[PDB]
């Protein structure tokens, strides 16, 4: 349905 993603560092 839905998700919040918090990305690892670039």
């Amino acid at each position, epitope marked *: 349905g839905s998700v919040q993603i918090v990305y690892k*560092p670039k």
Partner: nanobody, 111 residues
Framework: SGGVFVQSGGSLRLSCAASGATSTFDGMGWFRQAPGKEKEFVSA?????????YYADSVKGRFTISRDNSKNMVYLQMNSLRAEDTATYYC???????????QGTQVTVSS
């Protein structure tokens, strides 16, 4: 409303239950969201020993993430806290170091 309060320079340890590597997830970590700001990565660790230990630039050298697979626990040692660490801290499962959220610990650090 309510949360933890730490003096600048102080320390704090967080913990999070970690189910173990499912089909979808190979790790656990933490992000944080400060008042009026976006959610920001903090740290992530792999269930597999060696595989990955990511830190945001803003916390390198001060925070340490660790795992105890025997207890299904993950831990964040937060040292040398500063006022800019003030935020709500959330833990989430990780795949390859990215955090997936579908429940938080508010922390205020005073100068």
């Amino acid at each position: 409303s309510g949360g933890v309060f730490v003096q600048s320079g102080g320390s704090l340890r967080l913990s999070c239950a970690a189910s173990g590597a499912t089909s979808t997830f190979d790790g656990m970590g933490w992000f944080r969201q400060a008042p009026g700001k976006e959610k920001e990565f903090v740290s992530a660790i792999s269930y597999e020993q060696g595989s990955y230990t990511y830190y945001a630039d803003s916390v390198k050298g001060r925070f340490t993430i660790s795992r105890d697979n025997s207890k299904n626990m993950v831990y964040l040692q937060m040292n040398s806290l500063r006022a800019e660490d003030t935020a709500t801290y959330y833990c989430a499962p990780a795949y390859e170091g990215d955090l997936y959220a579908f429940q938080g610990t508010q922390v205020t650090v005073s100068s």
